[PDB]
């Protein structure tokens, strides 16, 4: 209903999948018996998201984040409209949606 929220929701889902892929990549990065941090990874992601200063910053950032997310099925079925939503809308709104996706990401793992 009122498909703007549909775009908002599958953006949240694709963000959660991309961040999960990035946490998996970090899991690959670490080695030996040190416990791979999980909460610290979320804190690092939040800090990097807050590091940006409009337009170019956070746009190339979040595009790179989605790209390093890996094979994202919902992204594959939703390349075009997600890209259009990225190009349009204020960047701070995109940051708010990304932060909400982070706050609601966990129950995947």
């Amino acid at each position: 209903n009122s498909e703007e929220d549909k775009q908002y929701l599958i953006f949240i889902k694709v963000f959660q999948q991309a961040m999960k892929g990035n946490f998996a990549k970090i899991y690959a990065k670490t080695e030996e018996g040190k416990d791979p941090p999980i909460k610290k990874k979320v804190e690092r992601l939040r800090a990097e998201l807050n590091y940006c200063y409009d337009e170019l910053s956070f746009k190339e950032y979040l595009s790179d984040f989605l790209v390093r997310g890996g094979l994202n099925k919902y992204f594959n079925e939703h390349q075009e409209e997600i890209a259009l939503l990225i190009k349009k809308s204020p960047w701070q709104e995109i940051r708010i949606w990304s932060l909400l996706a982070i706050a609601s990401y966990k129950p995947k793992d």
């Binding site: 595009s63 990225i86 190009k87």
Partner: peptide, 14 residues
């Protein structure tokens, strides 16, 4: 880049 209307091409972050 993705195709846009007419015979134009829109530039993305990629």
């Amino acid at each position: 880049g993705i195709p846009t209307r007419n015979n134009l091409l829109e530039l993305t972050a990629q």
